[PDB]
């Protein structure tokens, strides 16, 4: 059995194994970092089944749960938030914070989203690139999702820049473990203090809603509220940064499609749908353990055996998406959903927010900077390490 996670075939490409497995062995065993074996599911139809089957569990203290690193195994010990829950606990807690992420709520947030993107682009203009390229990640891709999610949680304007930097330090590949866990402690301590404040005078933010509607009635206590606020911050932010940077890089590699976006910014939604299919930047989140024996394709998954469902592989499934390895924002979409955001009950709570952010960015970026260009050769883009989720560490641009 091959070791898993697989490495990406190159900087922007998924692992090569998935294509071979989809054609010859779509449900296979892989070897995890700790020698334990797990089942790997690679086809769109089977990913959808894993994501929704009531015989499979996300509870991480069940025997056989497939942790991919040593830190996930100790992370498993902490009191769980709804990302690691099964029904009916899962939706009991998830529904406490879902109101802010509904399509209606996200529609009302659109003016604020546009203003955040506008402001940060204008800052970047004023900084200019008269002394060399600027890092689109640091100047724009990192603060855009960071400022929005922090603001929704209830962080006041003056604290945004410091906390944005701390959260970036958490997941920066060149941080030592001491730097990353200190940045991590910094974030938890700040949220605990903000929870204490909102318990005394609530405002109009997610933490205030949790304090008022759940903590004070006793449905949860303040430490649960900190953990839920922390989950909402860290679950999607690094992914959002990578999607933004990956969109810019992808457009630089497909000049003809960038020219269409420049001449019709209303194509941004369709560009965003294809970006999220093609660059599946969160590909290791759909994991389960089997509560009972369960049949997936021609394999029997025994109870207490772990499953990993690759939505990355599913998004390149030739049986669903014609010419899946071509980036085509003008593609015709089948009936089946792309799985960039997962599937079923656990499907990314922030799907509508994330798409509205991505769509606002790509309908605005090139209207502001019609000559935005990646300043290094495309073969020299600094992608994330090949053993991690696809992403871009830094992206020098001129405009
Ligand atoms: C392009 C950006 C993003 C992508 C591609 C993405 C992707 C995903 C994926 C694949 C999952 C697993 C879903 C499943 O189990 O079926 C997920 C879950 C989740 N995401 Fe996102 N995400 C993004 C942005 C965000 C943001 C901005 C937030 C928070 C503000 C967020 C919060 C969550 C949470 C809380 C879950 C767990 C939901 C649950 O288990 O009920 N994500 N996301």
Residue numbers in the entry: 5 to 403
Provide passages from the article that reported this PDB entry.
The structure of the resting enzyme consists of two molecules (A and B chains) in the asymmetric unit. The structure of the active site of the resting enzyme, as obtained by the SFX technique (SFX structure), is illustrated in Fig. 4a. These types of multiple conformations in the NADH channel have never been reported, which can be explained by the difference in space group between the used micro-crystals here and the previously used large crystals. No differences were observed among the protein moieties of all P450nor structures obtained in the TR-SFX experiments at ambient temperature.
P450nor is a heme enzyme that catalyzes the reduction of nitric oxide (NO) to nitrous oxide (N2O) in the nitrogen cycle (2NO + NADH + H+ → N2O + NAD+ + H2O). In the first reaction, the water molecule at the sixth coordination site is displaced by NO, forming the ferric NO complex as an initial intermediate. The ferric NO complex is then reduced with hydride (H−) from NADH, producing the second intermediate, intermediate-I (I).
